Amino acid sequence: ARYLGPKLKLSRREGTDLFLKSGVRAIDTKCKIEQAPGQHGARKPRLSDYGVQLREKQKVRRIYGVLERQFRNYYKEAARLKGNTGENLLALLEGRLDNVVYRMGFGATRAEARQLVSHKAIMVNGRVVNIASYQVSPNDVVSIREKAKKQSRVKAALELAEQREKPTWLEVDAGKMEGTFKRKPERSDLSADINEHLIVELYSK
Amino acid sequence: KIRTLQGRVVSDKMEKSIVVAIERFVKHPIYGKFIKRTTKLHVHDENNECGIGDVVEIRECRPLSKTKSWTLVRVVEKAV
Amino acid sequence: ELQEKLIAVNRVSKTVKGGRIFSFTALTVVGDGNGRVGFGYGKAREVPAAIQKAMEKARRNMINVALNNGTLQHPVKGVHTGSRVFMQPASEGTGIIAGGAMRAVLEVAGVHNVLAKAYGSTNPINVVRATIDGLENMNSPEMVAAKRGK
Amino acid sequence: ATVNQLVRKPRARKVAKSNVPALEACPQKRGVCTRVYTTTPKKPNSALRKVCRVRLTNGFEVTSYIGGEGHNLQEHSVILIRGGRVKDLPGVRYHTVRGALDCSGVKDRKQARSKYGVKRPKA
Amino acid sequence: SMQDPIADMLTRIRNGQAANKAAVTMPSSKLKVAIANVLKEEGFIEDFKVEGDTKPELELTLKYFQGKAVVESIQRVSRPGLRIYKRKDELPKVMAGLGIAVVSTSKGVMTDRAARQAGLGGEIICYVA
Amino acid sequence: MVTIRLARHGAKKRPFYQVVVADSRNARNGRFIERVGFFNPIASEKEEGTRLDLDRIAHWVGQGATISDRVAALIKEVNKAA
RNA sequence: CCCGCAGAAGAAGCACCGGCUAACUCCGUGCCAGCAGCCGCGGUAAUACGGAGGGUGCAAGCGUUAAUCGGAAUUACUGGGCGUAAAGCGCACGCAGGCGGUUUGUUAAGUCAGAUGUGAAAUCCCCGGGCUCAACCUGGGAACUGCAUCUGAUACUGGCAA
RNA sequence: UAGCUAGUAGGUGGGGUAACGGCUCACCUAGGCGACGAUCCCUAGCUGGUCUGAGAGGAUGACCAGCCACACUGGAACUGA
Ligand SMILES: [Mg+2]
Ligand SMILES: [Mg+2]
Ligand SMILES: [Mg+2]
Ligand SMILES: [Mg+2]
Ligand SMILES: [Mg+2]
Ligand SMILES: [Mg+2]
Ligand SMILES: [Mg+2]
Ligand SMILES: [Mg+2]
Ligand SMILES: [Mg+2]
Ligand SMILES: [Mg+2]
Ligand SMILES: [Mg+2]
Ligand SMILES: [Mg+2]
Ligand SMILES: [Mg+2]
Ligand SMILES: [Mg+2]
Ligand SMILES: [Mg+2]
Ligand SMILES: [Mg+2]
Ligand SMILES: [Mg+2]
């Protein structure tokens, strides 16, 4: 159910970095990025409103590490919820635990942050939660379990996390390795190069 | 009374076997137009008294024959 | 807010003595994204020339349309040739849903929450236009008082 | 037109004849292979298409297509048939599930083996 | 035929209007008037007049605003073939809010706005805008 | 006669009874006269888990109605007045 | 449900890539073998056949078939047509039926109004609560656009009268 | 498929059922139903709802709950609330 395949190949097709090797270095290169996702990589993807509509939601997916079925419901939920469908989708997608674990530093890459969750090395308001999909709400308190703490990974994880734009809606430690999800991110934080109404449009027809 | 019905006669030639018309009106449940929809009713009128073309008042009673569960109360007009 | 976009391009043949001689047809739509929309047609032996010659025609021939915020005031129906279109204000939930090809003229025209659908033939050259008029004929949500009053 | 008119005789919906008397709407049906012809197709195309005529579990006698490159199928072969006309072969309206009952999978196929019924070749 | 006279009124407007015709007249009726009334009170016609006695003569003054006429569209709704009766919660509002809907009620020919306030409903004669 | 019983509208392994007044002869999860409370045996020691319109129950019992054994408990367990 | 133990260890497939349609090249084949939802591909450079490399889409599923509705305003109440595209009976009179100018009175069936009862629970929806999330379970509202009784309103329609 | 109906429709009385009742009988009347579609023919358990549709609709009546009917086929009763 987890993609599992050559993570970088994705970013090159989607045409940007989706921080999946995230790890150490940045602004890729030392990769190959762009002009050959495949073998006819050179070719110019002159593409349907459909093409661009597709690739965008695809791009967003290859990021949060979600597969069609879940993502589809995420959209279906957004819509149900009052207030802009396209934004709401982005809300749900952020409240994801795996997300609110890399978005706290505790993990190099969302992919890795998730690996933690599945391995019950994380807790909400005290209790061990080990399912990625776990929706985090405001005031919540995600924290690394005492058992296996300041362990290899989680170090550099907390580290180059500071080298990131570094959030606002959430308040992290680094000694305790706890962290308070303070508010549901607004449209305005995160984003810029991601186009909702496209992917809303994709799931509209 | 508990409800009253109105309706003209239509048949009196039968020993208290009077049958009464009951013309309502109703919105066609699909095409909106209003249409006529009749309800013949075999009603009891002791001592056969009203005639065909008499308007009359009617009321639901218990059974008097496989067919009769109504009896008259008043008449209203005659010669049509 | 230059904002242009073509709806459809199409080959067409002419046929003479020596053979068929083909051309192309561009159908574009430009708008300020705040009122003022227009479409142009224009055709030409090569494609660039055609889409080109089209924007130009859509520079002029650009009418403008009394919005009511990001939306329409009331619902409206347009109808040219065999095309017959309908669109609604739709107190935006998000909106802008409508058959691509009038998404186009709606999009660049500034409306931000229409729901529309096209009946009849979906021949672009006639729905764009059916809608332009559709927005055109649509009357002033205030200057209907203008109309009345006296 | 008229409301009156519509009232007497309401509008009615054209009923849809199925194009595949796989009788009672059945995902497929069984049959014994009456005769295993091969004929040639319609105007534009030109070929020797393999087919078979099948007596069905429910007694329809119907002609069906035998997809693939080659097939070990003969008279008295018990096969499985599915919806799937062949426009080219007029009056051929069903296909034969390669790899069902007595029917074989296509030899050596690597691509689209699910169709044409072939086993994941011991990699 | 003469069987529906209100549609005949609606149309004599509709037509003359598109003919840029100053006035327009027609045989009167109680009903006819009560409507023209509403048309006037809501500023679609200029002013009416019933110059008759035995053979009454409803007569209307059309207005033209800019170059247009004031009546951009005048359709019948109810009609003797098919009568329409909306309750109150069901009363139809034309051009969103602009334009009107002439409706007869247990208390007189009013406008949907009016009838809505009144708290009642009835036969929705025609639409105007 | 007419009884007041539990009607396991629950869920496999995680039950949850509608307490109901019904015709004792009908199915446990079938036809009833009215609902008159519920009782969640997994309530958990958070807040709720045994609401019980005591005024109705007492009404039907005055009408004749009989009472279960596990309803019996719940009543002399919601103490009664406090 | 919790705790320990070992080792990445036991755990990835299916369809598609001519257009509609996200994804392209080589080899073979040569109107053959074959493909095909529709258009249509195959007669020597086939992105359409078959294999290969690459890619796109889904993922413990993937494809195919069968099936209802959808897009279909393609039975058009909402919401369509009949000069030449399917469609005005060869023409006329006329019963039933449908529709009916104009005033007043009356009636109050249609129509409209309020009140009241009823419209089982579940479901659906809204706001919560319980299972590590979810599916699932559950509190409470809301909704059930309906029907029926009473009382009123009289403009419109129908009845009666002139 | 355009006509259908002799317990047929109604009256009177006896009998009858837990009860109203052509339920049954005797007698009397000559009625009753039917183009707002009877009779005849084909198909079918109905509902809550279920899927779909923006709605209006269309399609449908597993799983849950309500009602009905049936218990190898046809027919009957006995017991019993
Ligand atoms: Mg799954
Ligand atoms: Mg206990
Ligand atoms: Mg492509
Ligand atoms: Mg293929
Ligand atoms: Mg070659
Ligand atoms: Mg339809
Ligand atoms: Mg047509
Ligand atoms: Mg013709
Ligand atoms: Mg009149
Ligand atoms: Mg309910
Ligand atoms: Mg929760
Ligand atoms: Mg009158
Ligand atoms: Mg007797
Ligand atoms: Mg529709
Ligand atoms: Mg069962
Ligand atoms: Mg028996
Ligand atoms: Mg007995």
Swiss-Prot record, chain B:
BP GO annotations: cytoplasmic translation; response to antibiotic; ribosomal small subunit assembly
Gene Ontology MF term list: rRNA binding; small ribosomal subunit rRNA binding; structural constituent of ribosome; zinc ion binding
Superkingdom in the source lineage: Bacteria
Keyword annotations of the record: Antibiotic resistance, Ribonucleoprotein, Ribosomal protein, RNA-binding, rRNA-binding
Gene Ontology CC annotations of this record: cytoplasm; cytosolic small ribosomal subunit
Something else known: The strain missing both S17 and L29 grows very slowly and has a rather unstable temperature-sensitive phenotype.
Similarity-based family: Belongs to the universal ribosomal protein uS17 family.
Task of the protein: One of the primary rRNA binding proteins, it binds specifically to the 5'-end of 16S ribosomal RNA. Also plays a role in translational accuracy; neamine-resistant ribosomes show reduced neamine-induced misreading in vitro.
HAMAP family named among the record's database cross-references: Ribosomal_uS17_B
PANTHER family associated with the record: 40S RIBOSOMAL PROTEIN S11 FAMILY MEMBER, SMALL RIBOSOMAL SUBUNIT PROTEIN US17M
Complex formation: Part of the 30S ribosomal subunit.
Protein name: Small ribosomal subunit protein uS17
UniProtKB/Swiss-Prot annotation, chain D:
GO biological process: cytoplasmic translation; Group I intron splicing; maintenance of translational fidelity; positive regulation of RNA splicing; response to antibiotic; RNA folding; translation
UniProt keyword annotation of Ligase present: no
GO MF entries: misfolded RNA binding; rRNA binding; structural constituent of ribosome; tRNA binding
Listed result of changing L56H: Protein is not incorporated into ribosomes
InterPro entries: NA-bd_OB-fold, Ribosomal_uS12, Ribosomal_uS12_bac
GO cellular component, one term: cytosol
Keywords: Acetylation, Antibiotic resistance, Methylation, Ribonucleoprotein, Ribosomal protein, RNA-binding, rRNA-binding, tRNA-binding
Sites bearing N6-acetyllysine, chain numbering: K107
Modified residues (3-methylthioaspartic acid): D88
CDD domains (UniProt xref): Ribosomal_S12
Entry-linked Pfam families: Ribosom_S12_S23
Subunit-structure text: Part of the 30S ribosomal subunit. Contacts proteins S8 and S17. Interacts with ArfA. May interact with IF1 in the 30S initiation complex.
Function: With S4 and S5 plays an important role in translational accuracy. Interacts with and stabilizes bases of the 16S rRNA that are involved in tRNA selection in the A site and with the mRNA backbone. Located at the interface of the 30S and 50S subunits, it traverses the body of the 30S subunit contacting proteins on the other side and probably holding the rRNA structure together. The combined cluster of proteins S8, S12 and S17 appears to hold together the shoulder and platform of the 30S subunit.
NCBIfam families: rpsL_bact (TIGR00981)
Protein family membership: Belongs to the universal ribosomal protein uS12 family.
Gene name of the record: rpsL
From Swiss-Prot, chain E:
Quaternary structure, from the entry: Part of the 30S ribosomal subunit. Contacts proteins S5 and S12.
A single GO BP: cytoplasmic translation
Source organism of the structure: Escherichia coli (strain K12)
SS bonds (residue pairs): none
Pfam families linked to this entry: Ribosomal_S8
Family: Belongs to the universal ribosomal protein uS8 family.
Protein name: Small ribosomal subunit protein uS8
Primary role: One of the primary rRNA binding proteins, it binds directly to 16S rRNA central domain where it helps coordinate assembly of the platform of the 30S subunit. Protein S8 is a translational repressor protein, it controls the translation of the spc operon by binding to its mRNA.
Gene3D superfamilies per record: 3.30.1370.30, 3.30.1490.10
From Swiss-Prot, chain F:
Pfam families: Ribosomal_S16
GO cellular component terms listed in the entry, alphabetical order: cytoplasm; cytosolic small ribosomal subunit; small ribosomal subunit
Molecular function per GO: DNA endonuclease activity; four-way junction DNA binding; structural constituent of ribosome
Ranges annotated as spanning the membrane: none
One BP term from GO: cytoplasmic translation
Description of what induces expression: Part of the rpsP-rimM-trmD-rplS operon.
Top-level taxon of origin: Bacteria
Keywords carried by this UniProt record: Endonuclease, Hydrolase, Nuclease, Ribonucleoprotein, Ribosomal protein
Classification via InterPro entries: Ribosomal_bS16 (IPR000307), Ribosomal_bS16_CS (IPR020592), Ribosomal_bS16_dom_sf (IPR023803)
Keyword Transcription regulation included in the entry's annotation: no
NCBIfam families to which the protein is assigned, alphabetical: S16
Family of the protein in this entry: Belongs to the bacterial ribosomal protein bS16 family.
Quaternary context: Part of the 30S ribosomal subunit.
Functional description taken from the UniProt entry: In addition to being a ribosomal protein, S16 also has a cation-dependent endonuclease activity.
Protein name per its UniProtKB record: Small ribosomal subunit protein bS16
Source organism (scientific name): Escherichia coli (strain K12)
